[PDB]
Short mmCIF file of C-alpha atoms in Angstrom, two decimals:
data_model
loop_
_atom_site.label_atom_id
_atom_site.label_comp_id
_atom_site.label_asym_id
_atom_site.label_seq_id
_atom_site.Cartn_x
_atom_site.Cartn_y
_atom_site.Cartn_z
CA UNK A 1 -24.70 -7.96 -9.30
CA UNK A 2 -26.10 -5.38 -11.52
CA UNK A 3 -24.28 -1.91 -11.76
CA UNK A 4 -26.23 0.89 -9.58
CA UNK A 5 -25.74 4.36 -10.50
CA UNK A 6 -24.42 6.89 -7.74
CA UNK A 7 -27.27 9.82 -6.88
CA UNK A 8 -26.87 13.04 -5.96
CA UNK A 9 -28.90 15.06 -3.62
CA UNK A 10 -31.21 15.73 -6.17
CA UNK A 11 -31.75 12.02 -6.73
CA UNK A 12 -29.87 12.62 -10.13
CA UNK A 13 -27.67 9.98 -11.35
CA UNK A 14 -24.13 10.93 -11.09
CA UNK A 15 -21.93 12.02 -14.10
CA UNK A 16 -18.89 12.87 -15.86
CA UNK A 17 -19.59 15.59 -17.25
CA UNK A 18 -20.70 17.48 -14.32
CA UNK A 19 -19.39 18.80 -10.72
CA UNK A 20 -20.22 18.08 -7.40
CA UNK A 21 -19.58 19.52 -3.86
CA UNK A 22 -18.86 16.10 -1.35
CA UNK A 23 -20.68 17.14 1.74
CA UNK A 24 -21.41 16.00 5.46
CA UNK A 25 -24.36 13.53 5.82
CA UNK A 26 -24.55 15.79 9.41
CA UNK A 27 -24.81 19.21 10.50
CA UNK A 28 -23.16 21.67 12.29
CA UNK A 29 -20.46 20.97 14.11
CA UNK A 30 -20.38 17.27 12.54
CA UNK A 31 -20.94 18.68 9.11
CA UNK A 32 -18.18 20.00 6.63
CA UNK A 33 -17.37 19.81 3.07
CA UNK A 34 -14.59 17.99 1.76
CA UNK A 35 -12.01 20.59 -0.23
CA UNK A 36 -8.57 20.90 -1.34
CA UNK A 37 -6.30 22.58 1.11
CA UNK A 38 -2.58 22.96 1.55
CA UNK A 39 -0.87 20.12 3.36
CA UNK A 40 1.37 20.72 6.08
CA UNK A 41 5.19 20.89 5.50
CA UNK A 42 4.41 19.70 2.06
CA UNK A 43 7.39 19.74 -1.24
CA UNK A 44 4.61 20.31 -3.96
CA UNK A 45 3.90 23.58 -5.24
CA UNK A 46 0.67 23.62 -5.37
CA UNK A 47 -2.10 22.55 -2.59
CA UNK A 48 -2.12 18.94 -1.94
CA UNK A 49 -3.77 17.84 0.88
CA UNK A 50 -7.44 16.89 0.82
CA UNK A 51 -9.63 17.82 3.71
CA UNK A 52 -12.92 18.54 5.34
CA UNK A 53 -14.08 21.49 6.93
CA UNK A 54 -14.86 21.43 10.61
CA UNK A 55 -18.54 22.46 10.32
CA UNK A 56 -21.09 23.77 7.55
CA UNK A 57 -21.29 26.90 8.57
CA UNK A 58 -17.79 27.90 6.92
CA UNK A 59 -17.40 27.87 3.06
CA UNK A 60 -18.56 25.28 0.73
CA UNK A 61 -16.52 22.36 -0.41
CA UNK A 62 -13.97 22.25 -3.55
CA UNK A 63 -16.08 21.15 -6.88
CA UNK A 64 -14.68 17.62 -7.93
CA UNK A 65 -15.21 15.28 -10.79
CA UNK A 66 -15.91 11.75 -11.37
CA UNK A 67 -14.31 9.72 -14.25
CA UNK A 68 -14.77 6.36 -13.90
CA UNK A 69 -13.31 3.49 -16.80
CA UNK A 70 -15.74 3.31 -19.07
CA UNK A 71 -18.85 5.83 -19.33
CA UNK A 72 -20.62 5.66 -16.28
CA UNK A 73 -20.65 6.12 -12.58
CA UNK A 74 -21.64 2.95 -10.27
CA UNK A 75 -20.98 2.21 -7.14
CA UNK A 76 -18.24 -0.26 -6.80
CA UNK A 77 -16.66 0.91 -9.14
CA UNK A 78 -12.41 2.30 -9.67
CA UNK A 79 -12.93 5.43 -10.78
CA UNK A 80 -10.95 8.88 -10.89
CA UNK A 81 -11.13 12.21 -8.51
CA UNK A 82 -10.55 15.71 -9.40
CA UNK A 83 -11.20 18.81 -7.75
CA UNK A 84 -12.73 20.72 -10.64
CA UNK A 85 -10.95 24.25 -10.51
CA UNK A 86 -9.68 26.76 -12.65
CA UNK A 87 -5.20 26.22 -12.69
CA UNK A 88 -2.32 27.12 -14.21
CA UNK A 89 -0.74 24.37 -16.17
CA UNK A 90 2.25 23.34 -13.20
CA UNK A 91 -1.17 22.44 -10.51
CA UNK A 92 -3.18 20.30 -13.24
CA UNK A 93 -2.14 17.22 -11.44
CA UNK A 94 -2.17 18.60 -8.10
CA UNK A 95 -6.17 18.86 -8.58
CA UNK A 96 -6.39 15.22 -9.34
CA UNK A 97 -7.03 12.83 -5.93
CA UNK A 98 -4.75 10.35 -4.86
CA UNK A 99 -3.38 7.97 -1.71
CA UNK A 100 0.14 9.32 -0.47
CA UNK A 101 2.37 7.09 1.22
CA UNK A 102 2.41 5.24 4.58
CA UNK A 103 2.73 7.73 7.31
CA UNK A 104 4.34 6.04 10.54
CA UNK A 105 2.38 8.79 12.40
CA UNK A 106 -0.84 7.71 11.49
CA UNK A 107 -0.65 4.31 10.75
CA UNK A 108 -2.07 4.61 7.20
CA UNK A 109 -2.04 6.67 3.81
CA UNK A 110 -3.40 10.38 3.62
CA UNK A 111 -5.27 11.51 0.65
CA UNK A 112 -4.03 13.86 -1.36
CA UNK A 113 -3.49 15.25 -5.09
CA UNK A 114 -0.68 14.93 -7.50
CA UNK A 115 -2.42 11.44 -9.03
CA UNK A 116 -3.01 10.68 -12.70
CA UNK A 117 -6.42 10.06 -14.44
CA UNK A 118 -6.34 6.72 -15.91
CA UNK A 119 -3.23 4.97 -14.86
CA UNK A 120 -2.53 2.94 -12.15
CA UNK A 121 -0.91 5.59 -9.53
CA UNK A 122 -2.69 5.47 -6.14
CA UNK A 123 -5.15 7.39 -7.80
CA UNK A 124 -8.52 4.98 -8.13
CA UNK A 125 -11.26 5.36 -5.74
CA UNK A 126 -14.83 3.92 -5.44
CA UNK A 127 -17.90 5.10 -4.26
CA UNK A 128 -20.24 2.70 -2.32
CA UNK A 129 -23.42 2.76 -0.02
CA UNK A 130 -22.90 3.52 3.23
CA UNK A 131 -24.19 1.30 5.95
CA UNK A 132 -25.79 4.72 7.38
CA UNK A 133 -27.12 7.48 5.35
CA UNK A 134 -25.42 8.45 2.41
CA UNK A 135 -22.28 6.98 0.86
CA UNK A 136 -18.84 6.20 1.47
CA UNK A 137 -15.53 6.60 -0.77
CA UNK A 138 -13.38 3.90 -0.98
CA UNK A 139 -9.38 4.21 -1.83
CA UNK A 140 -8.12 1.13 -3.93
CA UNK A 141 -4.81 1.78 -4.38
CA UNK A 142 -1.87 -0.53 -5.87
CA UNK A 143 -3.92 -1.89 -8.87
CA UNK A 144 -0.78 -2.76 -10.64
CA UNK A 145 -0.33 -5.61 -7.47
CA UNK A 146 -2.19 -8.50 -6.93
CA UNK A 147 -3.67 -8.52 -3.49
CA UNK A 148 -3.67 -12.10 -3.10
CA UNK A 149 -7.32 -13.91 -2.70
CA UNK A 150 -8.46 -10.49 -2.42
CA UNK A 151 -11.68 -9.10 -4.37
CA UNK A 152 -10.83 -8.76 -8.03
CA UNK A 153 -7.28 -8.94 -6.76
CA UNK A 154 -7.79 -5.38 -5.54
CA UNK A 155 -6.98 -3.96 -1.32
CA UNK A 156 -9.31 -1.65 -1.00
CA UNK A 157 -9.69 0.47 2.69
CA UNK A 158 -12.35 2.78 3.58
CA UNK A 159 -11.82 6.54 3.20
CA UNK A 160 -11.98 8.44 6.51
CA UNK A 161 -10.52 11.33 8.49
CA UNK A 162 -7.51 11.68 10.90
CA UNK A 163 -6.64 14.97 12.64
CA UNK A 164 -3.76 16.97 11.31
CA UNK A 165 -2.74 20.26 12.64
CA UNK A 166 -6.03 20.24 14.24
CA UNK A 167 -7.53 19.80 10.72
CA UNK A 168 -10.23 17.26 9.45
CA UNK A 169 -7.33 15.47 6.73
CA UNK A 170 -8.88 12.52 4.29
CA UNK A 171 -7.20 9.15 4.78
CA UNK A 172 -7.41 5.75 4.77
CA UNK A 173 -9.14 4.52 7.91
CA UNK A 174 -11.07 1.24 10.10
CA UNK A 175 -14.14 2.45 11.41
CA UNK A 176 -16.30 5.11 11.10
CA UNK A 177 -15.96 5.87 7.26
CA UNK A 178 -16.69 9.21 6.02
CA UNK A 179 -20.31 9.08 5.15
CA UNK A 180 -20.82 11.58 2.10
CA UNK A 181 -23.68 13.27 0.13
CA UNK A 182 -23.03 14.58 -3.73
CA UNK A 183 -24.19 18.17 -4.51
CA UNK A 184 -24.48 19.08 -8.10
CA UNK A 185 -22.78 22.54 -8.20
CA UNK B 1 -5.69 -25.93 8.83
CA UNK B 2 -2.93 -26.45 11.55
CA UNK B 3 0.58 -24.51 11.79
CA UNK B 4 3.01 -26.14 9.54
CA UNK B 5 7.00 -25.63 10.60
CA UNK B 6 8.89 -24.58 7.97
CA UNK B 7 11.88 -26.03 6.95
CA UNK B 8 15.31 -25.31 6.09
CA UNK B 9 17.61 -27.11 3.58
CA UNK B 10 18.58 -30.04 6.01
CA UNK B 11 14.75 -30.60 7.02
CA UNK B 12 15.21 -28.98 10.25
CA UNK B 13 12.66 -26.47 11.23
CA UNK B 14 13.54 -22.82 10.74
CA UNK B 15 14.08 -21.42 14.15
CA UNK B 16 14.24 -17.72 15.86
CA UNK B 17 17.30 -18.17 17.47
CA UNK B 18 19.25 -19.08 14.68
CA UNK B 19 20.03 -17.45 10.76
CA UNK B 20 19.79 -18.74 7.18
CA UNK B 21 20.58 -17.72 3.69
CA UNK B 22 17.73 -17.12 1.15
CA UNK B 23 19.17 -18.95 -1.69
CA UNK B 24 17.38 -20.13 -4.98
CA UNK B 25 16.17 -23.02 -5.89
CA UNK B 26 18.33 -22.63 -9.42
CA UNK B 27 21.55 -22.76 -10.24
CA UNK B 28 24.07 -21.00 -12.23
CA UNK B 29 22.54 -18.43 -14.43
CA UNK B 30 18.97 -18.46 -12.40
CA UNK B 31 20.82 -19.13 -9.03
CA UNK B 32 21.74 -15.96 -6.43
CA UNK B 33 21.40 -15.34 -2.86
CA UNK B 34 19.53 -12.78 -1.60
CA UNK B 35 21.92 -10.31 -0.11
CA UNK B 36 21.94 -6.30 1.46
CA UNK B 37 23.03 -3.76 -1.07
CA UNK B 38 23.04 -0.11 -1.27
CA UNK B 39 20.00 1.08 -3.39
CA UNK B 40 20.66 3.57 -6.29
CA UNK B 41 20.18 7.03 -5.31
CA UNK B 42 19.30 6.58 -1.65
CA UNK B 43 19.74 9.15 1.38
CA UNK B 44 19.76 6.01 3.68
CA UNK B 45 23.74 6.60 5.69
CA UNK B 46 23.72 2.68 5.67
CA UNK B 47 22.97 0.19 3.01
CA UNK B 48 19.14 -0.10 2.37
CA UNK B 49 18.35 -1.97 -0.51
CA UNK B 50 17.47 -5.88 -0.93
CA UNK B 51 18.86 -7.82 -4.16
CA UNK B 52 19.73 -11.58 -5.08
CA UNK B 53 23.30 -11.90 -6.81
CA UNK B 54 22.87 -12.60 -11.00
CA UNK B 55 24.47 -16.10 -10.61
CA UNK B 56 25.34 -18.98 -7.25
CA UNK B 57 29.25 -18.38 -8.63
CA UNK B 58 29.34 -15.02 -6.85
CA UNK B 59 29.42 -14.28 -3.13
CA UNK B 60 27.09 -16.03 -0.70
CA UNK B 61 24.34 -14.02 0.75
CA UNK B 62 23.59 -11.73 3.73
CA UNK B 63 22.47 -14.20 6.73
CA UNK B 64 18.69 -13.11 7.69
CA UNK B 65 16.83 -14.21 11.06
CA UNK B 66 13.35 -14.50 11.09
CA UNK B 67 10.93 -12.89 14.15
CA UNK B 68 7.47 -14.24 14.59
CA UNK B 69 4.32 -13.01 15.99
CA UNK B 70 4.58 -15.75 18.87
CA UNK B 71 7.49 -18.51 19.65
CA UNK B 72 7.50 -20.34 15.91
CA UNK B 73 7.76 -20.12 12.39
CA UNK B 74 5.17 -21.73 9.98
CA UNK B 75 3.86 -20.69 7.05
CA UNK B 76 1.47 -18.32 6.33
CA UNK B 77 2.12 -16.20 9.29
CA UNK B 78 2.94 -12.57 9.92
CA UNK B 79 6.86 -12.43 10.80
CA UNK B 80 9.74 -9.83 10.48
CA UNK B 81 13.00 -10.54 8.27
CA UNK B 82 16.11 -8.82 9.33
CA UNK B 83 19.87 -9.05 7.89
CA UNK B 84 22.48 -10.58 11.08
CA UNK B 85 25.40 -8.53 10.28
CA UNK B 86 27.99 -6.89 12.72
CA UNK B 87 26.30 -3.38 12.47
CA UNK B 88 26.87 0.48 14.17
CA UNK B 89 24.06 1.90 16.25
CA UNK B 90 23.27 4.01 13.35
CA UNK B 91 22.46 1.28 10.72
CA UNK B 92 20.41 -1.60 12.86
CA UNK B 93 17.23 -0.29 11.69
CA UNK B 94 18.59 -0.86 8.22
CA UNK B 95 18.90 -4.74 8.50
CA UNK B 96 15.41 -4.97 9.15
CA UNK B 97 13.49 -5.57 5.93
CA UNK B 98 9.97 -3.48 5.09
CA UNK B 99 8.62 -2.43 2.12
CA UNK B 100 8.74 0.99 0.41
CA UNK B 101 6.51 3.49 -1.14
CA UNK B 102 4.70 3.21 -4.33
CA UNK B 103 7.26 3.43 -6.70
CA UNK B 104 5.82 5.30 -10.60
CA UNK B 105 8.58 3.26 -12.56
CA UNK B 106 7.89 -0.24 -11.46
CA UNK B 107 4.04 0.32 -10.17
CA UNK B 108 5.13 -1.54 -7.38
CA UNK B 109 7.12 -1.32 -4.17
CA UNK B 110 10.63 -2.74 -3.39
CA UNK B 111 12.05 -3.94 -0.86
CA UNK B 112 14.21 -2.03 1.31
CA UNK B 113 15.53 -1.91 5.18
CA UNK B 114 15.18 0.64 7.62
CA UNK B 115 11.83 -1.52 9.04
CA UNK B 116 10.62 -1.87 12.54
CA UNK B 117 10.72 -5.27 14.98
CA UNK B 118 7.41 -5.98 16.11
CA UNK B 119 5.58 -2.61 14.94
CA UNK B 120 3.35 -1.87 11.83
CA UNK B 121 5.78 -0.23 9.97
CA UNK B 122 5.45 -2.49 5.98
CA UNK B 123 7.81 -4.58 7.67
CA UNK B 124 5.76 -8.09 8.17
CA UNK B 125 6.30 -10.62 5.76
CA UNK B 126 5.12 -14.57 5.29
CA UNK B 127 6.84 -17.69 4.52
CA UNK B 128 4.29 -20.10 2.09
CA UNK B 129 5.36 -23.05 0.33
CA UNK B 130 6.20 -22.13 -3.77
CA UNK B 131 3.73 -24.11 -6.72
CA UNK B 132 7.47 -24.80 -7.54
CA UNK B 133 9.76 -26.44 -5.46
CA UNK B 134 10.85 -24.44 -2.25
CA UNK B 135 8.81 -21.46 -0.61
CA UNK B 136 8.29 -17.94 -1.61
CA UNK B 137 7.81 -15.08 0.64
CA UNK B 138 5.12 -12.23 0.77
CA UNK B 139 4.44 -8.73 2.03
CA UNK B 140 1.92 -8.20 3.95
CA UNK B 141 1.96 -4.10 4.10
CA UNK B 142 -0.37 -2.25 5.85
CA UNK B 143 -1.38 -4.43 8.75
CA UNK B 144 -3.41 -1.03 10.64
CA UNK B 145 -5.45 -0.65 7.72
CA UNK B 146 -8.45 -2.89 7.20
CA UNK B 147 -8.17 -4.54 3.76
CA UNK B 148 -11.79 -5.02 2.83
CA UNK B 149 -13.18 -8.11 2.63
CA UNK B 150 -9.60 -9.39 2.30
CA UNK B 151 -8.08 -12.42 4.02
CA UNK B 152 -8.02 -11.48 7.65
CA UNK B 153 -8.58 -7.74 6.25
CA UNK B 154 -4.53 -8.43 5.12
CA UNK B 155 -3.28 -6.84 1.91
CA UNK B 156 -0.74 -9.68 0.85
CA UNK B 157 1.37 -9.85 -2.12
CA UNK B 158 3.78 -12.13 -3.65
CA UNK B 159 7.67 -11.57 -3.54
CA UNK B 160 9.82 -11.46 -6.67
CA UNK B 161 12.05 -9.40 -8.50
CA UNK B 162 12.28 -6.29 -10.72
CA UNK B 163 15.60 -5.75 -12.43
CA UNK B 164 16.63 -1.75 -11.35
CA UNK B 165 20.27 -0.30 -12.48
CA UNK B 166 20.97 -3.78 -13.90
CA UNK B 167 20.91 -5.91 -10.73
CA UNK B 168 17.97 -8.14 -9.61
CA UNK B 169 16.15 -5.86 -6.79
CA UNK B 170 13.19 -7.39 -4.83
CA UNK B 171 9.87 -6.01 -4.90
CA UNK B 172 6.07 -7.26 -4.90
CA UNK B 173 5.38 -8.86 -7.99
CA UNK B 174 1.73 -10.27 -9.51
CA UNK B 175 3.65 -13.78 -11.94
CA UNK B 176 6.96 -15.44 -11.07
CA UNK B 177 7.43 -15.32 -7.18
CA UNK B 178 11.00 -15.46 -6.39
CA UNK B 179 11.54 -19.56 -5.55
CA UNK B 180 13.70 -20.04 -2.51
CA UNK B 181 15.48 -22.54 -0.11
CA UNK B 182 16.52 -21.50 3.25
CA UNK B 183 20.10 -22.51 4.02
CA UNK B 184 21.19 -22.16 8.01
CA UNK B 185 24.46 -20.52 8.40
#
């Protein structure tokens, strides 16, 4: 298994020190950018819940960030996200993506911001091929736990969407992943 | 590989309709029963935390039944844990053990009550037999969310013990599962 670099729509390799839009494989009413919006009945004081948009035709997406461990960006690989933004110095962390806790109405854990870069707090992803067009994201939280006779010791779930509040809201999911495109802003 | 019973500490097999103590398989020093105790700082109204005592010279511990998926109890199988105490309306969800959110101090969760019967709720468990002697238990969070390419897409983790405010508190652990002997009451 030899490390494959992530492309963006440009056929680019993908890379840390540049931005990206996460956008719809479809169109229309199926497409819709993935930005940061404010979760409902949430404590923080910034914006904290990640979603996507119910179509294209709205804005475009929040900018985010890759940084993965070392220097590159493969698929397969834990890796950091942060919605790339300007901030004032309390919402820093509140840009950075992360998996919330268990929510007994959905069954699973939202995405949202508030993680860390480089730690081990909910906040690793990975980006993969998806078995459609495009790729999926990939939450692998817990990496301070061994998952026993897991891969790498890791549980890793597929990143989808739930409806919140009649909102497209980022979470951990069974079927039907997300399938995403990368759009060098 | 074909359901094995498991067994309490006069060989019988564990059993639904009856309760046990989790001891340890030491003694003195290394020896405590697992028992309910109010967790530090909690909003929980009843008792919500789950410890072992810091010696066997102490008290013995909180009885437990055990609730299977079907009729019996072998190893390696999905089952919920709850405390058989004499209990108010209010506080019977908080004999039934689950696991808690992501906690930053410990990277890990604990062990709490306030769990579900039968549900998804983190509050599924599994008795395996120890490398030691006796059996440990796991978690098995998460049971809606497809672990991927996981053992029967399960996120399982070993049981063991963090020491929090100076008392032994249980949580998932990755070395040292906590060894244990089940002791009918």
């Amino acid at each position: 298994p030899l490390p494959k670099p992530v492309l963006d729509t440009n056929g680019k390799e993908l890379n840390p020190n540049s931005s990206y839009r996460i956008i719809s494989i479809g169109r229309g009413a199926l497409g819709g950018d993935v930005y940061l919006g404010k979760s409902p009945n949430s404590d923080a004081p910034c914006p904290d819940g990640v979603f996507r948009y119910n179509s294209d035709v709205g804005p475009s997406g929040t900018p985010v960030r890759f940084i993965p461990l070392s220097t590159n960006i493969f698929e397969d690989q834990l890796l950091n996200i942060q919605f790339n933004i300007p901030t004032v110095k309390l919402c820093v962390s509140y840009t950075i993506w992360k998996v919330g806790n268990l929510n007994a109405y959905f069954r699973t854990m939202l995405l949202e911001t508030g993680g860390t870069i480089g730690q081990a707090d909910n906040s690793y992803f990975k980006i993969v091929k998806s078995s459609k067009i495009g790729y999926n994201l990939l939450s692998c939280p817990f990496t301070s736990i061994i998952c026993l006779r897991c891969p790498e010791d890791q549980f890793c779930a597929k990143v989808g969407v739930v409806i919140q509040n009649g909102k497209r809201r980022l979470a951990l999911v069974n079927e039907n992943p997300l399938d995403v495109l990368f759009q060098e802003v």
